[PDB]
Amino acid sequence: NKRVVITGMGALSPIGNDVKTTWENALKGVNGIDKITRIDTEPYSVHLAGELKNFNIEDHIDKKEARRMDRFTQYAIVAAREAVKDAQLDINENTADRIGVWIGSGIGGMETFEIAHKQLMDKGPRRVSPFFVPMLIPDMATGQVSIDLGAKGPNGATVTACATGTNSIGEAFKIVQRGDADAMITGGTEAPITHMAIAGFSASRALSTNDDIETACRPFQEGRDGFVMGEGAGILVIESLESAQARGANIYAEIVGYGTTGDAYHITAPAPEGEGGSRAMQAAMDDAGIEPKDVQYLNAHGTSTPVGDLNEVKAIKNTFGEAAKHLKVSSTKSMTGHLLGATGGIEAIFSALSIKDSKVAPTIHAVTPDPECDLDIVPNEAQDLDITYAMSNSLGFGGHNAVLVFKKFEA
Amino acid sequence: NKRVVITGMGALSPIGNDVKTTWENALKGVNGIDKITRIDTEPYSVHLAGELKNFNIEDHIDKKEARRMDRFTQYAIVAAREAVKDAQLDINENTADRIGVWIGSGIGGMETFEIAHKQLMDKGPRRVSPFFVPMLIPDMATGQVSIDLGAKGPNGATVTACATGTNSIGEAFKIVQRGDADAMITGGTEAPITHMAIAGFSASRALSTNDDIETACRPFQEGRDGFVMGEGAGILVIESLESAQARGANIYAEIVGYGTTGDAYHITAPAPEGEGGSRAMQAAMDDAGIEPKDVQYLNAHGTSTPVGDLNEVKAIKNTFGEAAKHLKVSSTKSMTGHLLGATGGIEAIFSALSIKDSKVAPTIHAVTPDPECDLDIVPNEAQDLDITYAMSNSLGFGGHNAVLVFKKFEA
């Protein structure tokens, strides 16, 4: 059973258009949420989202070969390129067949559908673009990324809502571990800031109606009224240890555990006591061959929803027990917003970078605490911390629970 | 490596509302393709499709709960129930945690999107149903299926276009094999017969505009002009050998191999000479520990497209070699149509049932033999054949290739 290491990272987030902007800004507690500029939010009750700032796709890809990509694919391509450059992974005739792509998108090409549906309705089916289908479907990020990079190994996408990025990485992890690829370009991507997504998520009352930016998203806090939608992509290049060392690559961290469970409870509501989340955390630690004692850091799912944030704390308290007081939890979503599919990818990056730099990003807006949520939230300011094992949680709609455990590399 | 066996099957297809009907009808070369009744097809050039016949959802699910499910989820629920009943898998307090769900849908809730987007446009954002999001996204079939059955093990969905059914099963296979679950309810589902899907696929020139119900879908033959769209769901209950034997379950077949590759060539067009397809077939055989000599049957992808069908034969020829003209290949899409997400599941079923009943389903409409596609396609009439190893290919849009290898249960 081969050892799997992280050799590259790529990111586009509301707080940075590359990994170290994103990461540095994350340690300074920067706010990615702001008034929506992408759409006219007049008829809605939500006007805030974590949009990418100062981002031009034409800086990265030619116009003709971009007009044929939905934003969610655009972000994946840019982030994957960054991660491959970072790992200095050479994808060529000798290596391509064993270098795969496994990038999920929870929502897919929402904007593309809206445009093409308007067309069919308002102007007839005959004027629907021949590029509609390959722009719309969730696996098109993976397909387009593999074409762009020449990667030919195992090729897929795990679509599991908010847990999409974490599951996709986990699958890619087990693909390398079983020896079916030497390297995988993996993670999550999402472009949900659209008419239909805002109207859909607020219809189901999952979105915050707060118009003020300084408290809109406030994980684990009094007054939290749902998550704030964000966009971006979190991509990892993961390799076998053999491969990484053979080509001489720098190692960020090792991936050692992956657990996934289902609540089998409600289609949108978390299972009471966060029971599914607990079983997922336990499975990931059983995979890693560790116990709760060994985990210093946990990047929480913490979306700033009443039940979610409460149920996660309950899950953590049940699973860790005594070690719950002596455990650093952070919800980086407080800065980025909930990136949906892409959130698990970006959080895997945050987690692995936390092990490397011995730091933990804060949970900003930690103003009005909660007697129910009595965990070490690493409030408002970044703390130093020596980490050996980090956890990342993703507990999304549909009852999907996904957890990854990362480990410091030393030999 | 733990041995993984198929204990249950469930199916909804254009040629039957359960496995027995579907399979029996399949061995008689029944035509599932007929004029579309789902929607007014007047402004389009395509008027045929493989719709479910005499299927009412209220026979299976109460109207109040069905109204909150897109057809693709409705199909997944009904087929999963059948496979569970078939396997007599009991999901309870002691088992649920180790029984997972992994059901993919390549397209998800196309109809739900069309309805909600229309309301958003000509009425307003506040008239959008609160059930829109959980009806729309692709992982909701897995979410709703696990809730309905109480299954709580690994929870996910592999979305890879036409290869969705096959990849999903491959993932579930690997989950049991690594011992992360005792059983998995897995497969593909799809409800693609919608305005936006017909307009989308014809715009990209992938659908036949043929009206002749008896020649619309002619896999591998002379006049083929694209695929014919179908709906349905193909669900398997797969289990560890130890588990199936402990609870006393009848075994259909064993899953022994799984390969997945990426073309890294074109978004819709197959890699030249089906090179990616060949690597996927080789990977699955390497996984299974067999050579091309050992395969008696291969359920081909064969969607009735010029380039696709030709490139698959090329892939088969390149990979099997001498054994190529001693291989029994067949494309069951000739009868069901191309079910997209569901097709991988429906074909895994056919492949496994082919090993059990030692009978191969035919490729109907094999009227005009194309000189380039010179394979043993089991023309028009079902043949008898002893099978030890069966292959199922799925090579779809986005450059995704997925191959499973099944094996007659030994001991």
UniProtKB/Swiss-Prot annotation, chains A, B:
Pathway: Lipid metabolism; fatty acid biosynthesis. It holds the Pfam family ketoacyl-synt. Belongs to the thiolase-like superfamily. Beta-ketoacyl-ACP synthases family. The active site is at 162 (for beta-ketoacyl synthase activity), 301 (for beta-ketoacyl synthase activity), 338 (for beta-ketoacyl synthase activity). This is 3-oxoacyl-[acyl-carrier-protein] synthase 2. Transmembrane segments: none annotated. SUPFAM superfamilies: Thiolase-like. One of its GO terms (molecular function) is 3-oxoacyl-[acyl-carrier-protein] synthase activity. Its EC number is 2.3.1.179. The keyword Acyltransferase applies. Keywords: Acyltransferase, Fatty acid biosynthesis, Fatty acid metabolism, Lipid biosynthesis, Lipid metabolism, Transferase. Residues 1-408 form the Ketosynthase family 3 (KS3) domain. Involved in the type II fatty acid elongation cycle. Catalyzes the elongation of a wide range of acyl-ACP by the addition of two carbons from malonyl-ACP to an acyl acceptor. Can efficiently catalyze the conversion of palmitoleoyl-ACP (cis-hexadec-9-enoyl-ACP) to cis-vaccenoyl-ACP (cis-octadec-11-enoyl-ACP), an essential step in the thermal regulation of fatty acid composition. GO terms for cellular component: cytosol. GO terms for biological process: fatty acid biosynthetic process. It is an enzyme of class 2 (transferase). The keyword Oxidoreductase does not apply. It comes from Staphylococcus aureus (strain MW2). It catalyses: a fatty acyl-[ACP] + malonyl-[ACP] + H(+) = a 3-oxoacyl-[ACP] + holo-[ACP] + CO2; (9Z)-hexadecenoyl-[ACP] + malonyl-[ACP] + H(+) = 3-oxo-(11Z)-octadecenoyl-[ACP] + holo-[ACP] + CO2.
